[PDB]
A paper describes a structure:
The asymmetric units for the EsxEFma crystal forms have a single complex in the asymmetric unit for the SeMet-labeled protein and six complexes in the asymmetric unit of the native protein crystal form while the EsxGHms and EsxOPmt (both crystal forms) contain two heterodimeric complexes. The WXG-containing loops are well ordered in the EsxGHms complexes and in most of the EsxEFma complexes but the majority of the connecting loops are disordered in the EsxOPmt subunit structures. Shape complementarity (Sc) statistics of 0.77 for EsxEFma, 0.74 for EsxGHms, and 0.69 and 0.71 for EsxOPmt forms I and II, respectively, indicate that the interfaces are highly complementary, with biologically significant interfaces such as antibody-antigen interactions generally having values in the range of 0.65–0.85.
Of particular interest are the Esx complexes which are dimers of two subunits (ESAT-6, early secreted antigen of 6 kDa; and CFP-10, culture filtrate protein of 10 kDa) and which are secreted across the cytoplasmic membrane by Type VII secretion (T7S) systems. The subunit interfaces in the four-helix bundles of the Esx complexes are similar to those of the previously determined Esx complex structures in that the intermolecular interface between the CFP-10 and ESAT-6 subunits is largely hydrophobic.
Numbering used by the authors:
A (entry chain A): 12 to 69
B (entry chain B): 4 to 38, 54 to 95
The structure:
Amino acid sequence: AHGAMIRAQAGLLEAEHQAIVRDVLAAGDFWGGAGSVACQEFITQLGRNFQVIYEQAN
Amino acid sequence: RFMTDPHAMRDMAGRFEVHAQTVEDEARRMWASAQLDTMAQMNQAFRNIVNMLHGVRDGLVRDANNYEQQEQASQQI
């Protein structure tokens, strides 16, 4: 059941990730456009870190 | 435009501060459920994430300030 908790906390973290991407898109101008390579790299780097955590939780 | 709106910029900073706070919280719970190098990787990913979110937050706040600065530097007098 300590495995269930970790999996759940992970799903929870993944929802956060998604909520952040929706906000990065809404604040896209900060990176000079939501489609700017500056924006997409921010997102890509964001995913790399969540992926690490997600992996080790599963 | 967003980046000419000190108030919108400072609102979004808010949202990013809340995300930082959320992810900090979920990291502590998650680290707790974890009960040493796999631990390092997770700790690191968590910090990286929280730092990125701090940056956007500090960036938006700095920019909101500087925009107000550009305005007052060209009205005073």
